[PDB]
Amino acid sequence: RQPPEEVDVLVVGAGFSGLYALYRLRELGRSVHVIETAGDVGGVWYWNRYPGARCDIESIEYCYSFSEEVLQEWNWTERYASQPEILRYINFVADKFDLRSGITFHTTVTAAAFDEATNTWTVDTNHGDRIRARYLIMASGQLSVPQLPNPGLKDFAGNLYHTGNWPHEPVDFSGQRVGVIGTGSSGIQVSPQIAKQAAELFVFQRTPHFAVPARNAPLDPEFLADLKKRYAEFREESRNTPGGTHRYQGPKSALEVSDEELVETLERYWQEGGPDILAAYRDILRDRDANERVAEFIRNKIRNTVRDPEVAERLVPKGYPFGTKKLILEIDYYEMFNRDNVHLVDTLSAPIETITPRGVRTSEREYELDSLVLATGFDALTGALFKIDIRGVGNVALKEKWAAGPRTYLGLSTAGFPNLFFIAGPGSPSALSNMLVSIEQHVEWVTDHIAYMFKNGLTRSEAVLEKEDEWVEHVNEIADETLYPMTASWYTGANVPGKPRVFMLYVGGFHRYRQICDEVAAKGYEGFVLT
Numbered sequence: 001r002q003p004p005e006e007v008d009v010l011v012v013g014a015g016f017s018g019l020y021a022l023y024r025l026r027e028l029g030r031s032v033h034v035i036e037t038a039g040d041v042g043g044v045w046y047w048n049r050y051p052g053a054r055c056d057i058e059s060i061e062y063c064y065s066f067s068e069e070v071l072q073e074w075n076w077t078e079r080y081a082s083q084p085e086i087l088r089y090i091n092f093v094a095d096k097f098d099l100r101s102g103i104t105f106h107t108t109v110t111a112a113a114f115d116e117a118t119n120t121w122t123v124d125t126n127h128g129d130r131i132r133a134r135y136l137i138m139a140s141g142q143l144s145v146p147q148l149p150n151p152g153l154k155d156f157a158g159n160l161y162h163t164g165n166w167p168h169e170p171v172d173f174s175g176q177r178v179g180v181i182g183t184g185s186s187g188i189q190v191s192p193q194i195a196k197q198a199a200e201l202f203v204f205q206r207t208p209h210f211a212v213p214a215r216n217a218p219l220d221p222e223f224l225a226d227l228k229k230r231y232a233e234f235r236e237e238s239r240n241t242p243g244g245t246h247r248y249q250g251p252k253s254a255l256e257v258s259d260e261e262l263v264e265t266l267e268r269y270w271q272e273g274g275p276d277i278l279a280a281y282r283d284i285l286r287d288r289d290a291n292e293r294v295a296e297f298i299r300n301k302i303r304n305t306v307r308d309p310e311v312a313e314r315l316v317p318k319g320y321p322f323g324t325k326k327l328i329l330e331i332d333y334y335e336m337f338n339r340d341n342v343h344l345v346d347t348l349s350a351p352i353e354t355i356t357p358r359g360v361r362t363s364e365r366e367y368e369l370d371s372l373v374l375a376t377g378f379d380a381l382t383g384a385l386f387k388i389d390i391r392g393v394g395n396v397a398l399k400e401k402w403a404a405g406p407r408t409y410l411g412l413s414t415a416g417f418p419n420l421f422f423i424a425g426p427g428s429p430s431a432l433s434n435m436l437v438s439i440e441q442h443v444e445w446v447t448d449h450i451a452y453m454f455k456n457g458l459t460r461s462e463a464v465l466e467k468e469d470e471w472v473e474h475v476n477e478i479a480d481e482t483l484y485p486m487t488a489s490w491y492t493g494a495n496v497p498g499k500p501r502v503f504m505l506y507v508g509g510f511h512r513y514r515q516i517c518d519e520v521a522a523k524g525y526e527g528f529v530l531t
């Protein structure tokens, strides 16, 4: 629109988090406005328009629950929503509640500084706006700053793309020699799409990722009508799980079962499709021998999928425990490699030397290409904030405080930066659960908190230094009882050169985490000092 001078609560970003903050603060009777870089609402589902983009949580799980009207009216069509359909859903929710009048688009926040004189935040943008707001809510997302791989990039003659900043006009790869770098789920979702148009598809793999089949399906309209009858009930069940979905929590240890029961329980998971296998046994994430048992089964499934055993073996992920990078759902990605026009280039054995203007040189050879797609992921969890000059008490940069890894109390707040809040970021369950559930819980908790400051005539909320320190020690310690910290992944910050290695997330589970938050709020926000 045109942003106001002054406001109770300013919110950065218009994706699932932003929009919800906005609605609920209006419903709390507070003044609120949102600033967003993009052209319209959407967040990851506005930016990641690459062909094949699709969620790995079931449509019925990956949605809002705050609005009974919305559960009733909206019709999902598939087990997993593709990106254009999740975007229609966000647009449907935005029209419903007229959220757009609360949002300025095309505008990036560049700086923010806390003024101890007034207990208020002063916020700057790239258009020149300067806004003043008692509270700052960073809803700038976890996987919102695209990351380019590490020499010869401006030299490329052909066309160049990132999956996480995809053009709005569809792209035509017909005829072309095309390369994709990256086999994350971006890489793995967009390749089979490209392999349909192009004359030649080169997939540049570094470390192979474990992917299991999605087995997408139509969503039976009967089933949806039935669920609608019990919908709030259904979400409440998800809200009472470690992961925020209906995944079954395998009670047994993967070491305890026989070999034949392992093959059967797991085979049954492979036929069903989806990520639920992750919780097939309790210790897949807590014990290296358990994990290797599941890992090997899956590796053989990957071997069975391609005819040419030389290529197959290049696709088998090695050297890290199963599940310790995000688990990826594939749809016809492994079958793709049986096509004549698809070539797997291993950069574990022959690293990428440089990009030339014609293509990509490994040690081994040069590869000539007309178009190049980077599926190389994001500066995850801390990227978005690090692009912003944020300054607290004593004029400390957040960049300086968090330089050795994020330091938070509950992930919600950082000491020395009062009245500042982070939605679904480091210090909290974040992307280790269904993010609609993590996100809704944080928005309700932060915004309850704001409501509670106003009713009680307070104006300053800061996390206590020693309570933040204890939360950090707690997060690291529970991380270190699992296999997560063992492995380089975006969870750790490992795909950004020179980024500190630190498992950035709460691994306890959504459910414990919520409990802790409710106790904290119940006690009057213990661990915070309010004045």
Ligand SMILES: Cc1cc2nc3c(=O)[nH]c(=O)nc-3n(C[C@H](O)[C@H](O)[C@H](O)COP(=O)(O)OP(=O)(O)OC[C@H]3O[C@@H](n4cnc5c(N)ncnc54)[C@H](O)[C@@H]3O)c2cc1C
Residues within 6 Å of the ligand: 012, 013, 014, 015, 016, 017, 018, 035, 036, 037, 038, 042, 043, 044, 045, 048, 053, 054, 055, 056, 057, 107, 108, 109, 110, 139, 140, 141, 142, 143, 144, 384, 388, 423, 424, 431, 433, 434, 435, 436, 439
């Ligand atoms: C391709 C993809 C698929 C995903 N699939 C799933 C899934 O399967 N399961 C699941 O649980 N989660 C999934 N996610 C994770 C995703 O982060 C969450 O599900 C959720 O959508 C994040 O919403 P958000 O509002 O918190 O952040 P975002 O959607 O990232 O919204 C942040 C917004 O803030 C904007 N912004 C950033 N900096 C500024 C600034 N300085 N000024 C103004 N605006 C700014 C960004 O442009 C962005 O639009 C996936 C993520 C990606 C990238």
Ligand SMILES: NC(=O)c1ccc[n+]([C@@H]2O[C@H](COP(=O)([O-])OP(=O)(O)OC[C@H]3O[C@@H](n4cnc5c(N)ncnc54)[C@H](OP(=O)(O)O)[C@@H]3O)[C@@H](O)[C@H]2O)c1
Residues within 6 Å of the ligand: 054, 055, 056, 057, 143, 148, 149, 150, 181, 182, 183, 184, 185, 186, 187, 188, 189, 205, 206, 207, 208, 326, 329, 347, 375, 376, 377, 378, 431, 490, 495
């Ligand atoms: N189905 C879905 O819902 C979906 C879709 C897209 C994204 N997401 C979310 O967003 C996260 C990001 O997925 P993503 O595929 O975009 O990114 P990613 O998981 O961070 O994977 C990035 C990929 O590019 C490679 N890469 C990065 N830098 C490189 C370099 N300098 N040289 C060579 N190769 C390099 C990595 O190889 P290495 O492993 O060896 O680093 C990896 O293949 C996902 O885990 C998930 O949370 C979800």
